Design a protein around this ligand. Structure first.
Ligand SMILES: CS(=O)(=O)c1ccc(-c2cnc(NCc3ccco3)n3cnnc23)cc1
Lengths: 366, 28
């Protein structure tokens, strides 16, 4: 087979601040029937938009951080498990996580602790309170945003030894794959008895019932590590079932797995020395740092923007990655680096954000 | 590899989708 997915650019706009847009995420927590909403992050700004019929990109709310020198690199949506109220977490150059109420567009609270900039934020797929942050300080941190606790710090002697660029939980939230500037990819199992007990303990913590601080777990050893996939920085990693997708400067998203071809991901030991490359989703001119690929909810489509305004899309249901390419999405007015893309939960819309502050709306044909 | 990995994706995303279907998150 081949890819048949087609899209048409229905709209575009440029944010008035004129600064690079570094991140974009649709709210996948919105219920069926409710409008399709996405957040963009860039400079000290967080902006909410609604995707209307006829291709309209309606500005909903604009958050401006009081710190003019803040540079947001990422955002991630969640919800309050007690009130069903949507929440948006943002972070960047200041190394501070800010939790925004997306209805009032006000910062509710912030998490200080990382010793440098935050590159990525990911919420656990089953538990909306479990927030993972990845930093230029060489560590990953797991936070419980309901009890305001630091659950764990993933770092130390066998942790990343350079700026951590990206991380992803697997579909069921049992494990994390992370990657760094020093070409290393590391696995951290969070379904261990130690991690499961730390999560339970973070739920029981309340500073009003004790004068003692909550003790975070210090995870110094990953459950697998490799520097034998890419030859340079790895700025984006995602799970594809039990397989991994990661990219470097090579103009390809590499599909690989820990161990040999037949090895089960859950039988992989921390001393595993083998790795297997399965295939490559190739593209052009995307060899500058901080360019992220995305997938739709069902993981049927893969997308990546490049440094000259082209949006590559692949069909993940075509076995051979070399043959999975969709028609590349281009526009004569879209010539700036596309930092990140986001599909709506139903995969009907694909949004791209650029270095020139522009937003591009691509609607999928049936 | 591809076929069994695709089945793992289908099954695991369907669990996430069923969990989402039970939710009524307030719109923005
Ligand atoms: C000189 S410029 O062109 O204004 C410019 C261009 C790019 C960036 C920049 C963008 N994204 C992330 N992180 C998110 C991320 C994406 C993949 C992994 O992690 N950063 C961290 N440090 N810098 C950045 C900042 C300034």
């Amino acid at each position: 087979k081949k890819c048949k997915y087609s899209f048409k650019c229905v709209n575009s706009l440029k944010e008035d601040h004129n600064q690079p847009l570094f991140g974009v995420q649709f709210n996948w927590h919105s219920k069926e029937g409710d409008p399709l909403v996405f957040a963009t992050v860039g400079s000290n700004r967080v902006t909410l938009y609604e995707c209307h019929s006829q291709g309209e990109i309606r500005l909903l709310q604009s958050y401006v951080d009081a710190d003019a020198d803040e540079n947001f690199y990422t955002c991630a949506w969640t919800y309050d498990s007690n009130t069903s109220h949507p929440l948006l977490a943002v972070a960047g150059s200041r190394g501070i996580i800010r939790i925004i109420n997306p209805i009032t567009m006000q910062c509710i609270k912030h998490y200080v602790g990382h010793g440098n900039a935050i590159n990525e934020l990911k919420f656990h797929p089953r538990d909306p309170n479990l927030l993972l942050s990845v930093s230029k300080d060489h560590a990953l941190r797991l936070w419980n945003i309901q009890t305001d606790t630091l659950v764990a710090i993933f770092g130390g002697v066998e942790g990343h030894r350079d700026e951590v660029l990206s991380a992803d939980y697997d579909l069921l939230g049992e494990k994390i794959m992370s990657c760094d500037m020093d070409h290393s990819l590391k696995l951290w199992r969070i379904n261990s008895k130690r991690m499961m007990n730390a999560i339970k303990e973070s739920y029981d913590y309340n500073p009003n019932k004790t004068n003692r601080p909550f003790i975070s777990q210090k995870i110094h050893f990953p459950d697998f590590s490799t520097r034998d996939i890419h030859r340079n920085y790895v700025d984006c990693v995602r799970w594809l079932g039990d397989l991994i997708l990661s990219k470097s400067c090579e103009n390809a998203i590499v599909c690989w797995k820990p161990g040999k071809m037949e090895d089960d991901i859950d039988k992989i030991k921390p001393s595993e020395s083998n790795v297997t490359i399965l295939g490559r989703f190739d593209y052009s001119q995307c060899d500058i740092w901080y360019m992220r690929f995305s997938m739709d909810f069902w993981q049927k489509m893969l997308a990546l923007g490049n440094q000259v305004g082209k949006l590559y899309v692949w069909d993940l249901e075509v076995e051979d990655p070399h043959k999975a390419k969709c028609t590349t999405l281009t526009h004569h007015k879209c010539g700036a680096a596309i930092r990140q893309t986001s599909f709506s939960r139903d995969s009907s819309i694909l949004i791209a954000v650029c270095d020139d502050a522009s937003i591009w709306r691509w609607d999928r044909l049936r | 590899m591809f076929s069994s990995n695709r089945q793992k994706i289908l099954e695991r995303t369907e669990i996430l989708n069923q969990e989402w279907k039970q939710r009524r998150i307030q719109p923005v």
